[PDB]
From a paper:
Among them, levansucrases (sucrose: 2,6-β-d-fructan fructosyltransferase, EC 2.4.1.10) catalyze both sucrose hydrolysis, with the release of glucose and fructose, and levan synthesis. Levansucrase from Bacillus subtilis, Bacillus megaterium, Gluconacetobacter diazotrophicus, Erwinia amylovora, and Erwinia tasmaniensis was extensively purified, and their structure was described. ,− All of them display a single domain with a conserved five-bladed β-propeller topology. ,, Comparison of different levansucrases shows that the architecture of the central substrate-binding pocket is also conserved. In particular, the enzymatic mechanism of sucrose hydrolysis and levan synthesis involves the action of a catalytic triad including two aspartates, acting as a nucleophile and stabilizer, and a glutamate as a general acid/base catalyst. To gain insight into the binding mechanism, the X-ray crystal structures of the beta levansucrase isoform from P. syringae pv actinidiae (Psa) in its native form and in complex with TPIS were solved, confirming TPIS as a competitive inhibitor of levansucrases.
To provide a structural rationale for the multivalent effect observed in the enzyme inhibition by TPIS, we first determined the crystallographic structure of recombinant Lscβ in its apo form. Moreover, the first 16 amino acids of Lscβ do not have a counterpart in the EtLsc sequence. Nevertheless, this N-terminal region of Lscβ was not introduced in the model due to a lack of electron density. The active site is structurally conserved, with the catalytically essential residue Asp62, the nucleophile Asp219, and the acid/base catalyst Glu3038. Furthermore, the residues that compose the substrate-binding site are fully conserved with respect to EtLsc, and their side chains have similar conformations and orientations. Whereas, both enzymes present differences in this region compared to SacB: Ser164/Ala148, Arg360/His321, and Glu340/Gln301 (SacB/Lscβ numbering). These differences probably reflect the belonging of SacB to GH68 subfamily 1, instead of the subfamily 2. The two active sites, which are deeper compared to those of α-mannosidases and do not face one another in the dimer, are 55 Å apart, a much greater distance than that between two iminosugar-ending tails of TPIS (roughly 25 Å).
Residue numbers in the entry:
A (entry chain A): 20 to 431
B (entry chain B): 22 to 431
Write the structure that this text describes.
Amino acid sequence: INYEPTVWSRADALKVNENDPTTTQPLVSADFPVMSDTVFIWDTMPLRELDGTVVSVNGWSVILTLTADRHPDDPQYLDANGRYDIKRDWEDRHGRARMCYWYSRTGKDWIFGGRVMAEGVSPTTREWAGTPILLNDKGDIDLYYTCVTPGAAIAKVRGRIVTSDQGVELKDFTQVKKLFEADGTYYQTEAQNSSWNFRDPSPFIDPNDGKLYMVFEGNVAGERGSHTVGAAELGPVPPGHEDVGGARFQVGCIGLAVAKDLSGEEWEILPPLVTAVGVNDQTERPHYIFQDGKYYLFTISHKFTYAEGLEGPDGVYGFVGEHLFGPYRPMNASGLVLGNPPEQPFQTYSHCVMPNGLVTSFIDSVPTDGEDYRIGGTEAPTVRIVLKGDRSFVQEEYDYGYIPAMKDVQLS
Amino acid sequence: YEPTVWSRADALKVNENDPTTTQPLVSADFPVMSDTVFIWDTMPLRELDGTVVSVNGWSVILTLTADRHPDDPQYLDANGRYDIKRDWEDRHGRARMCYWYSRTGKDWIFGGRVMAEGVSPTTREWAGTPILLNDKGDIDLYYTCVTPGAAIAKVRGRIVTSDQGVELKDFTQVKKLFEADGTYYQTEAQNSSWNFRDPSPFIDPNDGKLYMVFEGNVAGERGSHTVGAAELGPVPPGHEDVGGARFQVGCIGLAVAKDLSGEEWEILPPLVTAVGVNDQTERPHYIFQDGKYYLFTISHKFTYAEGLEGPDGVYGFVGEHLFGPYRPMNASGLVLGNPPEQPFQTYSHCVMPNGLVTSFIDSVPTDGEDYRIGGTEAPTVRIVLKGDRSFVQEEYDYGYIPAMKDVQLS
């Protein structure tokens, strides 16, 4: 299987408008509530089927979160005056990340369910994001996730959900199987770049050929600093935008893999679907909506992972087309689907666009009086978007962490 | 077929600050082509497939033209001050078609009036398209006769050339082809500011029939139109109020000819409508490229409805079928906008199939809070089209309109 990737060019990124009211996330309130005073949560992963549908089980909604403890009373984060450095505690989350689950009858007011896997089950101490798939009405679940440090592998672990009128348990996630890692020909490896990105599996059944595929975040293969920013990467920039500076250091891509069969036990990597060399280093958490005969491929990125000479917000970006292997076109012409507002540029991250149009994200940093800011580590308000052809439009907002079921599955 | 709606929600995506869709700045010291006439809307000689053509090596353009009056007491105050801005605003009622020619596609030589005074049924001769019909030099000039009423019309004539230049001759009998009907397009009785003008004929690349697009307004008594869900589109919270938007009712119209002679026309329903968005979708014209129909139209900042903001310049809609549906170029519709620091520098853009875009100079700011009037050609600029998007490229000299193909007369 061979196909050329869709290039997200610099010329495309010069169309990004951070001030478009149709593509701006609503402002998060400075007095947002926090789901936990003992843990931070961030990347949130709704339970779903391989076709994309977000599901409850026996009337319980279930989400997985990356989770790290809070350390307010810990001397290493306390200065001479006993002030707590929450910002540093929050920045330290990534090395402590573990998968936990939460549940609710209502799609909000989440009840903590605890760790998915016992400590030591994961091959790496870090357990980074992926997708929990409900496989059947017996309650079997495949959790696809990323094992990081040493190395980075996309992995899966099988377990089960059981419920009662009192709540949910996830059990028996006891054997992790690594599936694949970066190869060095299509996707950049650790030996080529110790800051390589390789993570966030999103598995699905393709609506057209019915095979099991996954997309994931990668980087375009090649030694750090070797990539070329040539015509394709620059695109048809206007006069005075020819200089790229050190843009060749930014090399994000959305990757694709295909399973040998529908069990998803053996995978083969395919070439990059969408590349952003010279544009942005991080095309994170890629995921699809299948709607109106089109593939809508969304990906999250940061203002500060852009190449020199470009400006855009943290938030959701997207590419659309009629065929799984492309070519794709940038949503809203620039690629930007939902950007943080410029007055609160880091208020939310790790958005997940669900097929009902609702978009969930977590709160990162919200400005407060005195040119300060508060840390979130909790769910943001959900907001709905509508897709129309190659364009999107932001609509109304919902409560914090609202993630309703699209379908309820009753267990056998 | 149902029209494509350009909605308010689409228009809220218009970005006046995008470097890929901004016209280059016009220099304060631009040259003027004539110190005796203003020119504005410029119409290159072309074939019915869109190709811009020279004839025996001569490029030819038509312009709307009006005299300048710098020594006329009606524009002069007691102190000798010349009200050029008023003279320029008064051009519309003095408009006549003239032609110009050049071996080089610039440094245009004045050819004079196309039609003798009195040939046109109306004194005003407003814009359209000159079509070179064959290698004998026959030409159909499609144009608009305005006041009283507004009719799309045509007049047949011919071009002859020599080593010394070009003549356009024998344009002596105008035939009116059609006017607004009142069910598809708005009429004078429904709105005395009705828009109905600017014919752009072409042979469709798919069915081989002769059609034309033109500027209209959606039919209905002034003030009666509804700005409902389709016109509003999926606006975000806080953008529900439309104020007086139902008074802005621009559309791009379509008509079809009985046969390839283009002597008898039937109107068809509007292709693209902008009720509640903008009153003026002017000079519609196509490029046929990459299996698509790119339909461009020019509009003004000051013809937008309340609650919307966009620049003077070129807008566009793209699709795969003549009858639609079409999608707005660059998501918002904007293709090339004037820069916000010189918002009225150019107008009446004509995108040619080689990507070059010609426009005229209107007003350019100068030293102080002052400005200069144009009435002369602006620098040509090239755009490139990529799917449903466009990107501005390099600029060329003032009024550069090179031929795509030369036709030797037999």
